[PDB]
Design an enzyme around this catalytic site. Structure first.
Site, PDB file in Angstrom:
ATOM      1  N   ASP A 149       0.791  -1.199  -0.174  1.00  6.93           N
ATOM      2  CA  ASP A 149       0.032   0.169  -0.025  1.00  6.93           C
ATOM      3  C   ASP A 149       0.631   1.223   0.042  1.00  6.93           C
ATOM      4  OD1 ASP A 149      -2.462   1.328  -0.021  1.00  6.93           O
ATOM      5  OD2 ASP A 149      -2.457   1.612   2.115  1.00  6.93           O
ATOM      6  N   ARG A 153      -0.581   9.149   0.492  1.00  4.14           N
ATOM      7  CA  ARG A 153      -1.534   8.874   1.522  1.00  4.14           C
ATOM      8  C   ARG A 153      -0.874   8.290   2.579  1.00  4.14           C
ATOM      9  NH1 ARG A 153      -3.817   6.132  -1.844  1.00  4.14           N
ATOM     10  NH2 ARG A 153      -3.888   3.883  -1.585  1.00  4.14           N
ATOM     11  N   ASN A 154       0.256   7.431   2.578  1.00  5.98           N
ATOM     12  CA  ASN A 154       0.652   6.673   3.560  1.00  5.98           C
ATOM     13  C   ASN A 154       1.952   7.152   4.154  1.00  5.98           C
ATOM     14  OD1 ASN A 154      -1.664   5.001   4.095  1.00  5.98           O
ATOM     15  ND2 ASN A 154      -0.940   3.764   2.429  1.00  5.98           N
ATOM     16  N   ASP A 167       1.864   4.339   7.229  1.00  6.70           N
ATOM     17  CA  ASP A 167       0.692   3.537   7.477  1.00  6.70           C
ATOM     18  C   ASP A 167       1.143   1.856   6.886  1.00  6.70           C
ATOM     19  OD1 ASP A 167      -2.653   4.158   7.695  1.00  6.70           O
ATOM     20  OD2 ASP A 167      -2.283   2.271   6.213  1.00  6.70           O
TER      21      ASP A 167
HETATM   22 CA   LIG Z   1      -4.365   1.404   8.681  1.00 10.26          CA
HETATM   23 CA   LIG Z   2      -4.679   2.845   6.245  1.00  8.62          CA
END
Ligand SMILES: [Ca+2]
Ligand SMILES: [Ca+2]
EC number: 2.7.10.1
Lengths: 300, 37
Positions: A149, A153-154, A167
């Site tokens: 991922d 955004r992370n 994240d």
């Molecule tokens: Ca998470």
């Molecule tokens: Ca997340």
């Protein structure tokens, strides 16, 4: 979940300000007491998880928490404490003053209401972010882990602007086989996924490396929605067929090059996070080798 | 602005779930499916 060497005394955590209306819970900034044996009070980031959350999010939360417990990298948001003792549960992380990269980028847009008073990231600054994220990713892969991922955004932006990974809900263990294969139905970051992952549900470091490229595209475009104008359906077909995003206007040739590398259709042509960091080592802030995993001794 | 998408890899070919109501079900299920392990 079950307590361990972390689970910190709630009475040691104070919630100052709110920094994000999550849906699974929230993200608060606060001050702590007696966390780092040596310092009295230290300001931290606190990610909560709603008592009444999602049967799915909960798990992805603990995974994140747990997985972090083993990391130690200047470029990977540091975990400080946990609190399973009474809802809502807490995960005490190092405070990344400037928020998540997506939001930080989105705020550089000239049209931005919450503009920071500065221009978009410049070639130098990019190379910097690029290598730091790369490093953090390198470290991650080393400790035998595939992210799955990776996305702006992370990533988190610290007070001094160092970018780090923050994240880990979708991260998976790969020490065993070096890859992850999605079994059945599930929710995945299609717009950031690599062809093979899209095609066979297989996630490898190269797929993360591909995402890396996308993150560069996000940066160089101030977080636009990848393959904007294309339906989730259309994006699959488009990328599985050999499609890739276009360079944003005024995109540093040098970062474009990096993307052409990350988007090689054949996973084995894609570079490694280390090869990347290496490809950059020369043009970075001096405080890099001191902190970088790449230059560390743990890299051998 | 969405981020995650519902998919299914059970079967020879990949697949981004097309039915609104089915895709919306994936969430809860991916959750249970994990509980078991
Ligand atoms: Ca998470
Ligand atoms: Ca997340």
């Amino acid at each position: 979940y079950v307590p361990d060497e972390w689970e910190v005394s709630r009475e040691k955590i104070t919630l100052l300000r709110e920094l994000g209306q999550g849906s699974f819970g929230m993200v608060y900034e606060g001050n702590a007491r007696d966390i780092i044996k040596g310092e009295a009070e230290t300001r931290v980031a606190v990610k909560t998880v709603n008592e009444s959350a999602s049967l799915r999010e909960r798990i992805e939360f603990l995974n994140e928490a747990s997985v972090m417990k083993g990391f130690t990298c200047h470029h990977v948001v540091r975990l400080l404490g946990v609190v399973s003792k009474g809802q809502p549960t807490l995960v005490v992380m190092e405070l990344m003053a400037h928020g998540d990269l997506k939001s930080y980028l989105r705020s550089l847009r000239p049209e931005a209401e919450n503009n920071p008073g500065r221009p978009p990231p410049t070639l130098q600054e990019m190379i910097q972010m690029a290598a730091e994220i790369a490093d953090g990713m390198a470290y991650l892969n080393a400790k035998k882990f595939v992210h799955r991922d990776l996305a702006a955004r992370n990533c988190m932006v610290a007070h001094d602007f160092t970018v780090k990974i923050g994240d880990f809900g979708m991260t998976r263990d790969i020490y065993e086989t070096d890859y992850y294969r999605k079994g059945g139905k599930g929710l995945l970051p299609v717009r950031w996924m690599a062809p093979e992952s899209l095609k066979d549900g297989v996630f490898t470091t190269s797929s993360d490396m591909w995402s890396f490229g996308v993150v560069l595209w996000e940066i160089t475009s101030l977080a636009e929605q990848p393959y904007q104008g294309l339906s989730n359906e259309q994006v699959l077909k488009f990328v599985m067929d050999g499609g890739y995003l276009d360079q944003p206007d005024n995109c540093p040739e040098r970062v474009t090059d990096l993307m052409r590398m990350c988007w090689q259709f054949n996973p084995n042509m894609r570079p490694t996070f280390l090869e990347i960091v290496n490809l950059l080592k020369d043009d970075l802030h001096p405080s890099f080798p001191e902190v970088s995993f790449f230059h560390s001794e743990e890299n051998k | 602005e969405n981020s995650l998408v519902a998919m299914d890899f059970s079967g020879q070919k990949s697949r981004v779930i097309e039915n609104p109501t089915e895709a919306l079900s994936v969430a809860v299920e991916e959750g249970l499916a994990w509980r078991k392990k």
